């Protein structure tokens, strides 16, 4: 199956004293593997998965140097953006940046991403070709001109098609015991009566990895979306994921309804019945 490496960066300004709160996290697929938190004592990029602890002190020195540089870029950006948008020094503002690479089942480059938001709104993003920019407004268009003149897209494309995919492959190999293992959903159904004529069936998927999954209901073999509720996939906290989908049915007609589960860890989709 496909894989990805992504880095997420958030800076939140602190009006009145000092630099922004900066938090960086890195993921391989749905697995967090590194973090940096400016409020933490170490001031180092820190490991969050056992397989990254294989990397030597040179790796940690490098990631720490680079992530501190990212924090300084965001500090400057918060000031620049306050100027572009004619905002006061009174309020807290947020910058978010995400970038990374997707590879296919053959671990070859599929797509790269580099996008930026100010106060939760799209600001500027690299297009799919990795050669030009989508700027949402005139402030971002000023950034686009600056980044065009400085050949930023070229630098990012080299990183995304090169370093990003090379280190993703390295991590996939080093962390193979977990990163290349799929955990199929563990499924069951629960039943509740709300009244003498209405029941709820809830189809559960637990303990799965990666997070991507599809859960659907059928009635007499036909897709059923009405009277259903599908919750957001949620982290268990042990590295796996959970999800459920429910349907409301006439009491006594439970037999008509079937839940269908698709996941990379299941060779064939699975069916459950009450």
């Amino acid at each position: 199956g496909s894989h990805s490496m992504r880095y997420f960066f958030t800076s939140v300004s602190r009006p009145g004293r000092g630099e922004p709160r900066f938090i960086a996290v890195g993921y391989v697929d749905d697995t967090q593997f590194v973090r940096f938190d400016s409020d933490a004592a170490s001031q180092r990029m820190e490991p969050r998965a056992p397989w990254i602890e294989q990397e030597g002190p040179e790796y940690w020195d490098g990631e720490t140097r680079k992530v501190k540089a990212h924090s300084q870029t965001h500090r400057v950006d918060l000031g620049t953006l306050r100027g572009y948008y004619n905002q006061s020094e009174a309020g807290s503002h947020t910058v978010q940046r995400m970038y990374g690479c997707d590879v296919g089942s053959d671990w070859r480059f599929l797509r790269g991403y580099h996008q930026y938001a100010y106060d939760g709104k799209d600001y500027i993003a690299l297009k799919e070709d990795l050669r030009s920019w989508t700027a949402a407004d005139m402030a971002a268009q000023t950034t686009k001109h600056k980044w065009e003149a400085a050949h930023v897209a070229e630098q990012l494309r080299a990183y995304l098609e090169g370093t990003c995919v090379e280190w993703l492959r390295r991590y996939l190999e080093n962390g193979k015991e977990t990163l290349q293992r799929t955990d199929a959903p563990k499924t069951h159904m629960t039943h509740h009566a709300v009244s003498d004529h209405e029941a709820t069936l809830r189809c559960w998927a637990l303990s799965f990895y990666p997070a991507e999954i599809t859960l659907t209901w059928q009635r007499d073999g036909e897709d059923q979306t009405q009277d259903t509720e599908l919750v957001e996939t949620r982290p268990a906290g042990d590295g796996t994921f959970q999800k459920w989908v429910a349907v409301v049915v006439p009491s006594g007609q439970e037999q008509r309804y079937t839940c269908h589960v698709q996941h990379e860890g299941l060779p064939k989709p699975l069916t459950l019945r009450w």
Binding site: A24, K66, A69, H70, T73, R97
Partner: peptide, 9 residues
């Protein structure tokens, strides 16, 4: 492995 430059807006 993170990018070695971070570009200001």
């Amino acid at each position: 492995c993170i990018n070695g430059v971070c570009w200001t807006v």
